Amino acid sequence: KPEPTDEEWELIKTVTEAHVATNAQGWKQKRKFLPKVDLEAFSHFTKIITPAITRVVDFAKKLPMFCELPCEDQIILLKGCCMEIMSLRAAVRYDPESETLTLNGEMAVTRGQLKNGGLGVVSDAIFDLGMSLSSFNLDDTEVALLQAVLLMSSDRPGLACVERIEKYQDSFLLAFEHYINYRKHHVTHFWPKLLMKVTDLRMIGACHASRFLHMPTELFPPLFLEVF
């Protein structure tokens, strides 16, 4: 089973570090269990959205490949994957004992809070992912690599460098699988099942976008509105 090359070991070091550097309190100790849909639920959530969006922006910037694209491309790639990444980042922090996700490394939310907080069915999707990601035992390199795959998505509307972006994603995909091969998880068909999680995360990002077409806008943090 092919294990990672040396150029790939360096790409794994690059992405892991950029992720660790932009991941809140890498946190179970520094927790804060929170208590038609109440805009009072919005307050706690929209107030924590901007610091989360920013961390994704910071992860992106710390990948050279990302910095080599034209700004209008960087904007489109960040719009398209921000919720996908914030969502992976909460899902790997699912605690089966409390049945909670940890947002921003501190706030512990439940299925019910996130849903009635305005996320709706997307809440069930993210909890379901976290539950099903428990047995995967993804480490910081695996998560960072999933993030780079979502970030470097060639099919986002308006992109100029479709060909370059695709070439970068192929790169991360090969490092990711060779690292997966190296790690020998005690789970069957590990690589296939991960690619299925990537589709689960991309459904979360497409449904969030669609659910943001709801009526005022000034009530919503300004960076949240700029990443729909």
């Binding site: 904007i75 960076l223 700029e226």
Partner: peptide, 11 residues
């Protein structure tokens, strides 16, 4: 129009 994003990306 992606003014805050644009800022956070150039800085």
């Amino acid at each position: 129009e992606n003014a805050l994003l644009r800022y956070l990306l150039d800085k």
